[PDB]
Structure formats: C-alpha cells, structure tokens
Paper text:
For crystallographic studies we used [name] because its binding site and binding properties are identical to those of DYNLL1, but it lacks a free surface exposed cysteine and hence is chemically more stable during crystallization. Crystal structure of the Ac-[name]-[name] complex was solved and refined at 1.31 Å resolution. The asymmetric unit contains four chains forming two dimers. All residues were in the most favored Ramachandran region except for Asn51, which has a positive ϕ angle, as in all other DYNLL structures. Both Ac-[name] peptides bind identically to their symmetry related binding sites forming a sixth β strand in the grooves created at the dimer interface. Interestingly, in the in vitro evolution derived Ac-[name]-[name] complex Ser-4 participates in an analogous H-bond with the same threonine.
The [name] dynein light chain (DYNLL in mammals) is a highly conserved 10 kDa protein that was originally described as a potential cargo binding adapter of both dynein and myosin 5a motor proteins and as an inhibitor of the neuronal NO-synthase enzyme. It is now considered to be a eukaryotic hub protein. Apo- and ligand-bound structures, determined both by X-ray diffraction and NMR spectroscopic studies, revealed that DYNLL forms a homodimer possessing two identical ligand binding sites. In the complexes two 7-residue peptides bind to parallel grooves at the edges of the dimer interface expanding the two central β-sheets.
Author numbering:
A (entry chain E), D (entry chain G): 1 to 7
B (entry chain C): 4 to 89
C (entry chain A): 3 to 89
Write the structure that this text describes.
C-alpha cells in the first residue's frame, strides 16, 4: 500500500 | 459537500457508506492522498481487501473492478473513485 | 510537452521505460485523460497479463495496493500517470 | 473494465 499526490 | 453519484456497481448500503466515509475523510484532511488513504483503509477493514481510492479535481481513469464493488462520485467539485480489485 | 519524470516506482527499469513509451504513444493519439489511461491499461494487460489500472490527470491523490514490482507513478509534461497491477 | 473522466 502506497499513495501519490500531484504537485 | 453536495454528494453526487455518477457511476456505481455497488449495493445501496455500501454506496451510502462510501459517501459517509468520504465525507468524514474530507472533514479530517485537506490533502487528496490522505483523504484517499482514509477511505481505502476503512473499506479494507469493513469490506475486506483490496480496495483502491483516487480523490481529485482533474483525472481520468481506466480500471477493472470486481462485480458490485465500484463507485465514482463527487463531493462538491472533488471526484472520488473507489473500487475493489484483488 | 511530454518530457518524462519518474516520481515513484516499484518496477523493473525496462518495464518503467515501456510504461513511458506507452504513455507517450497514448498522448500522441488521445486528447482525453480517460482515453490515455485506457490505452495504457489495455496495452499493459496484453503484454504483462491482467489486471492493470491507470489514472491520468493533473490533480489527484491516490492510495492503492499493488503487486510487488508492478507500480509506477510518473509525469509526462504536466500530466501525472499512475499505473499499477492488482488482481 | 471501465473509465471515468472529471468534467
């Protein structure tokens, strides 16, 4: 499990 | 904010729980990743793994979901994609 | 503007390159983020077996669970692409 | 398999 976030 | 369900292959009760869970997430967090994480983690716990969640104002998706486990909805101008696969 | 920048990966280097090349072709062909995503997902299902999922966009966060060695998150120009296998 | 697109 892991996440991302746009700039 | 105002919940508008766009697509759903999901029971009525689970749809409402998705909305409720997202609403709680948006109360707690500002960061999209963190809203997504809350919703995913709650759904894994309540309805078994494996869920995936996307929260954002600008995106397109193409995914494959298990039957009866897909919802796409807005709270205000923020779109939420939540589905099971795995 | 389609310069590639890898943000996070759990993927072989050659598969990362293939993902970039696939997304580049997708963006040459398709204007709409959903359709870009669909091209990439479908090509990865075909080449690397199902089940892949793809998000393409300028503003989003995610939290997902992937299979070991099958996750990438990258930009092409100003568009972010998340591509991963689960199922 | 299916897609979504923000408006």
């Amino acid at each position: 499990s892991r996440g991302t976030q746009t700039e | 904010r105002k919940a508008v369900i766009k697509n759903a292959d999901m029971s009525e009760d689970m749809q409402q729980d998705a909305v409720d869970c997202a609403t709680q997430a948006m109360e707690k967090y500002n960061i999209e990743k963190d809203i997504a994480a809350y919703i995913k983690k709650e759904f894994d716990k309540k309805y078994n793994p494996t869920w995936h969640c996307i929260v954002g104002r600008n995106f397109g998706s193409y995914v494959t979901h298990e039957t009866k486990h897909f919802i796409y909805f807005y709270l205000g101008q923020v779109a939420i994609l939540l589905f099971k696969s795995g």
